[PDB]
Subunit: 347 residues, 4 copies
């Protein structure tokens, strides 16, 4: 059954060298459960955990990775709603104290004692990884653990963002960055939730991919010069809600100018030092909200995975082996990324 | 009854010279009603209508003023829910087309055809002024038309702002600029709505005035250096909702750093070229919303006037004569303002 | 252009005899607009206006009918957002005082001075009928005025009901009475809004029609005995929101027993003396809400017509002539109804 | 420190004989914490747990009681946000599986595996009792554990009920049963939350008590015959939200007739076989909601205790000894109850 040693990609100092080597198998605490992580997505947050450029101190030595779909192989003692052989998911937020005000309200991510898998907890870039039983995702049985792994971070983040834009069905939503990664998952979640997706991206074959996943209007930010005017025209007044899955400060600032009066602008990405300099007079005189959206609680996880489990959203991935890390890390530092990159822990 | 000529303070060109002289008595259209404006507040928006520095073009020649409490002396033809001798109020938003999407949703202020009394409509700085019957405020009988006049713009703006911070009773609210004008009315509305008012202002006798109107915690922004730390300490994590009644860009930017995780920051003032440069990473990672709030619809008017009509909020004013305009205009351009300045139209 | 005499179906006493005869052409007041009603739906509310069995007193003599799609042929004087040749729609609520608390809040239907077209106002069973310009529906250009006429009452009522069940996308909704009239329009609106429609109806060819308009689960209330158990099984706990488009007291009472804990039960129909006897202990211990839903405001009209104008909902009708009234009235008194019955005013 | 045997009031069969005798000291599980219950309120739910008349099966032998304020004397192993000597509170809902859909959404009370302290868990009628660490209340330090004990069930139930009536500040709330037990706590919570409390109760000295705790209007249901007309008069249209803390079916049915159009009627009590037979036509035509409200989650506990900890709500109690049980049980079966009855576990 559970071995005494597994193979993980561990690094010992910030921005250091990633070693795919044998490490011990963790011991599930009385609240945690052990997960034979089958696959695990890789995303920019793993770069930011590697470098350590974010304020929160990173635990070291660290097995990064926070989008890990796997099988429950043995649990803790108080673990209640879980069985062995159940599929589980390691998300960004591994666990919280569940006694603080935020955990009680539902926003466990704002917990001061938040355990961030792959940042301050042994993440999912290993074969066997532990995850708090309360927060682990209840991936249904029979789902492709390869495809759901990117949905564990990008899908749950964009489901929360589209629920944070206070949109109603039929309302225009403008996904700034609407093809690739968070953008395409946001387009599919918005289309499944009822909204009328407008997309703002550019490059080769972006518009046909966008139309394929069910987008309504596509503003090519290369061909088109005035994006704000194009969005105000296509939406007939402005997008009812904007989802800024593009961390560039210019796009973020522009999204406050094509969002409808009384419309919401959700910021999803976490840049290093970006600022949302928005004209205060225009934001006041048009009653525009500029919301920020973090990972999303257990209800948003349940509902995003339930959208996935109906074939409504699909995550085209590229599966590689766990040993291909850190070629993915060094490839991601430059910008040679396309879609989502899943790693298989066995390979 | 209704004369054929009244005395108003009218100017003929932007930033020009204000003439307190005889002008005609308006004719109420079939939707409008004529109001013997008894008193009328003066506020910074009247400076901005005078200069014309805002984007929207000002009608000229113009009798400014948009906080006018008065008596209904004759109405139009389709005016339905009004009688003669009824008290009415001229607010910023005079009327809208009531057929556009926004008017239907409730946000009449975002109407493209919004009639802005004192900007694109003969305002309330005259004896007799017309106002759309749908939008005019239903000032109850027996109220002091001198005191309710400032409540027609500052009170209704801060009631909307505190309803836009999505606060619940017992939640901390931090009124940045919590003494004088919008600030003290916001403190009284917040205290009447249930919130626990924190105040951030400085000067002489500001803290005692604040405590008098029912404030809980007062951070003196002159004595105290680190305001953010003081608010995080007093509120035990941050204010649940911030109301930025101080248009300074530094205070606006700081208010995004002492608002609670999952907390809202309402921007109330309309500066000329201010920007709310907020750290995108912090706003995302803490799920902070930055809402803007405009005048407020007819329901917010009904409810703000209903709070006033219970003696819960009180507007200490300085009553002058209508002939004292434009000494108030030139006094306001410099910054010799304190509290609210009401003008009596008879005097 | 506008004639001086048209042909309408008018009756002079409650439950009397309906006379398809020549009547005058109304004169649009300064707020109203005249509509060459092209088509007009017929629904049970017209029976209830005919009999007069409802509490509110019916104006007599009365041209009933309240789902009238037509062309704006001449308007009033203050009518602002309208042109000639524009398509308009006469809904149940013709107009309100727009100065009362309810009109201000958005719920114009609760106005004490509500003008109910076809009950206390010359309805849409005539060629030319007047309707308040604020409340008339803004039917887009090019839409089939025959098909949108049933959407003016059933579609707008079920869009409001599904927005009153506080559902989120992916939540189960159970349309009790899910084929025919309000039921099929509710199924199509629920499917377009994102919910997962469960249907509860019985008869011939009901399930295939249901599947055609996009239903997910169909409980045949003839084949199946325990409906509550079947819904709890299909929904995995209960429907998140129930829409009771079947006025039978047994179905209404059962819908409080298969709605999810913390779920909503919207009552749409207006029976004569039905009661919703719900077990108080079960409703408390499961936090079940039992909402009622009326016609729906101008925003719900705009949004329901916008769903229709995307081909998302479709109203299969039977078009007859206006002279076929009152054969439809006497046919409807018995129960020989199927789908929706539109009348053409020219024929 | 922690003894090996304490004194509790335990019964061994439904409706049997209550024995105040020595029982063992429980062992806190790895999630639970042990509480030296200092005081404990007694309420009708304890009668219903004793008789066993409710559907859910009662654990036997059982130490009832579910409003127990006490001191944390030793905790479990994974208990995170707790220290020794901390004040804790045993509420109705002792713990849930925290992996089900409801627990995730926030409504832990609807959990199928809900542990109901004093029904299916050793309650708080003993000296030392265990309670799940996640759900136990965080009673602040220095509070009178005698007074907060009734607030642990009645206060948290009425805070949830007033938050379930979707009221805004200044809206009328009508507490049907507005003096004694749930009623007076609901009056104080409603007054602290901002609403304008109307009260409906009768007897000696009820109106003066009501006025003392901050009620606005009191309809004496003995002197007054038409309660509905009196409430519609006092509220000027109906109460915006009704709180039915009186389980009588006649009062519940009447509360659906004096609640405002678009108003909410919260049912708080859990009778044995009561039904809320409401006129469906009136509920539809006025858009009235009839919500039910259960215990309330950890956020509602935090916020109700935070209202208590500001001296805004006060619970006048009668403290007796734990040995006086079951004289309180047999006294409560008849109806010789007044206010709240706290038992001291030491005495
Ligand atoms: Zn926590
Ligand atoms: Zn990620
Ligand atoms: Zn308009
Ligand atoms: Zn003003
Ligand atoms: Zn009205
Ligand atoms: Zn109809
Ligand atoms: Zn649970
Ligand atoms: Zn209790």
């Amino acid at each position: 059954s559970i071995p005494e040693t597994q193979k993980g990609v561990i690094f010992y100092e910030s921005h250091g060298k990633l070693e795919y080597k044998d490490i011990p198998v963790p011991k599930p605490k009385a609240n945690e459960l052990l997960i034979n992580v089958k696959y695990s997505g890789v995303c920019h947050t793993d770069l930011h955990a590697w470098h350590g450029d974010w304020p929160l101190p990173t635990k070291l030595p660290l097995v990064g990775g926070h989008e890990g779909a796997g099988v429950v192989v043995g649990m803790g003692e108080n673990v209640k709603g879980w069985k062995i052989g159940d599929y589980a998911g390691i998300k960004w937020l591994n666990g919280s104290c569940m006694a603080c005000e935020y955990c009680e309200l539902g926003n466990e991510s704002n917990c001061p004692h938040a355990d961030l898998s792959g940042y301050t907890h042994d993440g999912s870039f290993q074969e066997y990884a532990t995850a708090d039983a309360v927060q682990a995702a209840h991936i249904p049985q029979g789902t492709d653990l390869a495809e759901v792994a990117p949905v564990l971070c990008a899908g749950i983040t964009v489901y929360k963002a589209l629920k944070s834009a206070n949109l109603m069905a039929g309302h225009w939503v403008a996904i700034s960055g609407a093809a690739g990664g968070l953008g395409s998952l946001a387009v599919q979640y918005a289309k499944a939730m009822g909204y009328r997706v407008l997309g703002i991206d550019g490059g080769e074959g972006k518009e046909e991919l966008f139309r394929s996943i069910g987008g309504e209007v596509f503003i090519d930010f290369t061909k088109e010069k005035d994006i704000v005017g194009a969005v105000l025209k296509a939406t007939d007044g402005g997008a009812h809600g904007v989802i800024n899955v593009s961390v560039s400060e210019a796009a973020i600032e522009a999204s406050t100018r094509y969002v409808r009066a009384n419309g919401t602008t959700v910021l999803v990405g976490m840049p290093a030092g970006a600022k949302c300099c928005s004209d205060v007079f225009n934001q006041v005189v048009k009653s525009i909200s500029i919301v920020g959206s973090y990972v999303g609680n257990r209800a948003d996880t349940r509902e995003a995975l339930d959208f996935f489990a109906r074939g409504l959203v699909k995550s085209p991935i590229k599966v590689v082996g766990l040993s291909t890390l850190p070629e993915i890390y060094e490839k991601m530092e430059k910008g040679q990324i396309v879609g989502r990159y899943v790693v298989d822990t066995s390979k």
